[PDB]
Amino acid sequence: DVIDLFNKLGVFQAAILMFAYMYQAQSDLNLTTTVNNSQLEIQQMSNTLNLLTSARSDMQSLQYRTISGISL
Amino acid sequence: GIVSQTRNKELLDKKIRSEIEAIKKIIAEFDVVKESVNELSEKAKTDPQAAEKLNKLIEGYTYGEERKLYDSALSKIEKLIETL
């Protein structure tokens, strides 16, 4: 590969795979407390999604700009 | 209420799982990008229009826009792992 995509994507894929299992681990694991902790999880999960979707958008722009560049 | 909270956690979780699969897919589609980029090389052998494109791409992925987009996404994922 001319543009060292192998390492770029390998490191990126490793980040994702590590994140995926770690998230998966949290994900699968006084009433006032309970209601508050969940509200906090919802707050975190929400940010996670935002940061995660931002990353997704970046990887897309990457693809778009690359492909655009290979054709003009 | 407990029920609303559960519904919201399920939504988020599903949303997040989709973002993971989407990314995993985007990463896979990058092999097409790999193949394309190598084809651009072959064409660069004889064609200088291709050569100029390739070099622009190379600079882009090393200290240009593509590289920055890339670092951006990667650091966001690292930030996520961080908060875990």
CSV table of C-alpha atoms in Angstrom, one decimal:
chain,number,residue,atom,x,y,z
A,1,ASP,CA,0.0,0.0,0.0
A,2,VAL,CA,1.3,3.4,-1.2
A,3,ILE,CA,-0.3,5.5,1.6
A,4,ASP,CA,0.4,3.3,4.6
A,5,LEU,CA,-3.3,2.5,5.1
A,6,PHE,CA,-2.3,-0.8,6.7
A,7,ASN,CA,-0.9,0.8,9.9
A,8,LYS,CA,-3.5,3.7,9.9
A,9,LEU,CA,-6.4,1.3,9.7
A,10,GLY,CA,-4.8,-1.3,11.9
A,11,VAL,CA,-4.3,1.1,14.7
A,12,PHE,CA,-7.8,2.6,14.2
A,13,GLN,CA,-9.4,-0.9,14.1
A,14,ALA,CA,-7.5,-1.8,17.3
A,15,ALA,CA,-8.9,1.3,19.0
A,16,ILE,CA,-12.5,0.3,18.0
A,17,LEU,CA,-12.1,-3.3,18.9
A,18,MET,CA,-10.8,-2.4,22.4
A,19,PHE,CA,-13.5,0.1,22.9
A,20,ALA,CA,-16.2,-2.3,21.7
A,21,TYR,CA,-15.4,-5.0,24.2
A,22,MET,CA,-14.8,-2.6,27.1
A,23,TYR,CA,-18.1,-0.9,26.4
A,24,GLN,CA,-19.8,-4.3,26.1
A,25,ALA,CA,-18.4,-5.1,29.5
A,26,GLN,CA,-19.8,-2.1,31.3
A,27,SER,CA,-23.1,-2.4,29.4
A,28,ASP,CA,-23.8,-5.8,30.8
A,29,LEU,CA,-23.5,-4.8,34.5
A,30,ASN,CA,-31.5,3.6,48.0
A,31,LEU,CA,-34.2,3.7,45.3
A,32,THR,CA,-33.1,7.3,45.0
A,33,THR,CA,-29.6,6.1,44.5
A,34,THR,CA,-30.7,3.7,41.9
A,35,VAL,CA,-32.6,6.3,40.0
A,36,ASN,CA,-29.6,8.7,40.1
A,37,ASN,CA,-27.0,6.2,39.0
A,38,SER,CA,-29.1,5.3,36.0
A,39,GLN,CA,-29.6,8.9,35.1
A,40,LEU,CA,-25.8,9.2,35.2
A,41,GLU,CA,-25.3,6.2,33.0
A,42,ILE,CA,-27.8,7.7,30.5
A,43,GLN,CA,-25.7,10.9,30.6
A,44,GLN,CA,-22.4,9.0,30.0
A,45,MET,CA,-23.9,6.7,27.3
A,46,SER,CA,-25.3,9.8,25.6
A,47,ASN,CA,-21.9,11.5,25.4
A,48,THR,CA,-20.3,8.2,24.3
A,49,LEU,CA,-22.8,8.1,21.4
A,50,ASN,CA,-21.9,11.7,20.5
A,51,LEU,CA,-18.2,11.2,20.6
A,52,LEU,CA,-18.7,7.9,18.8
A,53,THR,CA,-20.8,9.4,16.0
A,54,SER,CA,-18.3,12.2,15.6
A,55,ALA,CA,-15.6,9.7,15.0
A,56,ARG,CA,-17.8,7.9,12.5
A,57,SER,CA,-18.4,11.2,10.6
A,58,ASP,CA,-14.6,11.8,10.5
A,59,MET,CA,-13.9,8.3,9.1
A,60,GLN,CA,-16.6,9.0,6.4
A,61,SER,CA,-15.1,12.4,5.4
A,62,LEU,CA,-11.8,10.6,5.2
A,63,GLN,CA,-13.3,8.0,2.8
A,64,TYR,CA,-15.1,10.7,0.8
A,65,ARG,CA,-12.1,13.0,0.5
A,66,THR,CA,-9.8,10.1,-0.4
A,67,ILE,CA,-12.1,8.7,-3.1
A,68,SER,CA,-12.8,12.2,-4.3
A,69,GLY,CA,-9.0,12.8,-4.6
A,70,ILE,CA,-8.4,9.5,-6.4
A,71,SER,CA,-10.8,10.7,-9.1
A,72,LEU,CA,-9.9,14.4,-9.5
B,1,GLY,CA,-39.7,6.6,36.0
B,2,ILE,CA,-37.7,3.4,36.1
B,3,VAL,CA,-39.4,2.3,32.9
B,4,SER,CA,-38.5,5.5,31.0
B,5,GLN,CA,-34.9,5.1,32.2
B,6,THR,CA,-34.7,1.6,30.9
B,7,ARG,CA,-36.2,2.5,27.6
B,8,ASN,CA,-33.6,5.3,27.3
B,9,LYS,CA,-30.7,3.0,28.2
B,10,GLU,CA,-31.9,0.5,25.5
B,11,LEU,CA,-32.1,3.2,22.9
B,12,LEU,CA,-28.6,4.6,23.6
B,13,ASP,CA,-27.2,1.1,23.7
B,14,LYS,CA,-28.7,0.2,20.4
B,15,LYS,CA,-27.6,3.5,18.9
B,16,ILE,CA,-24.1,2.9,20.2
B,17,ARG,CA,-24.0,-0.6,18.8
B,18,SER,CA,-25.0,0.7,15.4
B,19,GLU,CA,-22.3,3.3,15.5
B,20,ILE,CA,-19.9,0.4,16.2
B,21,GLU,CA,-21.0,-1.7,13.3
B,22,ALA,CA,-21.1,1.3,11.0
B,23,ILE,CA,-17.5,2.0,11.9
B,24,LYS,CA,-16.5,-1.6,11.5
B,25,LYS,CA,-18.1,-1.5,8.1
B,26,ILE,CA,-16.4,1.8,7.1
B,27,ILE,CA,-13.1,0.2,8.1
B,28,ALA,CA,-13.9,-2.8,5.8
B,29,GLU,CA,-14.8,-0.5,2.9
B,30,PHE,CA,-11.3,0.9,3.2
B,31,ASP,CA,-9.9,-2.1,1.4
B,32,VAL,CA,-11.7,-0.8,-1.7
B,33,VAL,CA,-9.9,2.4,-1.0
B,34,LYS,CA,-6.7,0.4,-0.7
B,35,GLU,CA,-7.2,-1.3,-4.0
B,36,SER,CA,-8.2,2.0,-5.7
B,37,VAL,CA,-5.1,3.7,-4.4
B,38,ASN,CA,-2.8,0.9,-5.8
B,39,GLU,CA,-4.6,1.2,-9.1
B,40,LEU,CA,-3.8,4.9,-9.1
B,41,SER,CA,-0.1,3.9,-8.7
B,42,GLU,CA,-0.1,1.6,-11.8
B,43,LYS,CA,-1.7,4.4,-13.8
B,44,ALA,CA,0.9,6.8,-12.4
B,45,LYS,CA,3.6,4.8,-14.0
B,46,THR,CA,2.7,6.1,-17.5
B,47,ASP,CA,0.3,9.0,-16.6
B,48,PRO,CA,1.5,12.2,-14.8
B,49,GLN,CA,-2.0,13.3,-14.1
B,50,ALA,CA,-2.2,10.2,-11.9
B,51,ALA,CA,1.2,10.8,-10.4
B,52,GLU,CA,0.2,14.3,-9.3
B,53,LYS,CA,-3.0,12.9,-7.8
B,54,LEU,CA,-1.1,10.2,-5.9
B,55,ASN,CA,1.4,12.7,-4.5
B,56,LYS,CA,-1.3,15.0,-3.4
B,57,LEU,CA,-3.0,12.1,-1.6
B,58,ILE,CA,0.3,11.0,0.0
B,59,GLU,CA,0.9,14.5,1.4
B,60,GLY,CA,-2.7,14.6,2.5
B,61,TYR,CA,-2.4,11.4,4.5
B,62,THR,CA,0.9,12.4,6.0
B,63,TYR,CA,0.6,16.0,7.1
B,64,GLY,CA,-2.5,17.2,5.3
B,65,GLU,CA,-6.3,17.0,5.8
B,66,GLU,CA,-6.8,13.2,5.5
B,67,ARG,CA,-4.2,12.7,8.3
B,68,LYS,CA,-6.0,15.3,10.5
B,69,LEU,CA,-9.4,13.8,9.9
B,70,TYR,CA,-7.8,10.4,10.8
B,71,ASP,CA,-6.1,11.7,14.0
B,72,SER,CA,-9.4,13.3,14.9
B,73,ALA,CA,-11.4,10.1,14.8
B,74,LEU,CA,-8.6,8.0,16.4
B,75,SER,CA,-8.3,10.4,19.4
B,76,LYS,CA,-12.0,10.4,19.9
B,77,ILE,CA,-11.9,6.6,20.2
B,78,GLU,CA,-9.0,6.8,22.5
B,79,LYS,CA,-10.9,9.3,24.6
B,80,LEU,CA,-13.7,6.8,24.8
B,81,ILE,CA,-11.4,4.0,25.9
B,82,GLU,CA,-10.0,6.6,28.4
B,83,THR,CA,-13.3,7.1,30.1
B,84,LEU,CA,-13.3,3.3,30.7
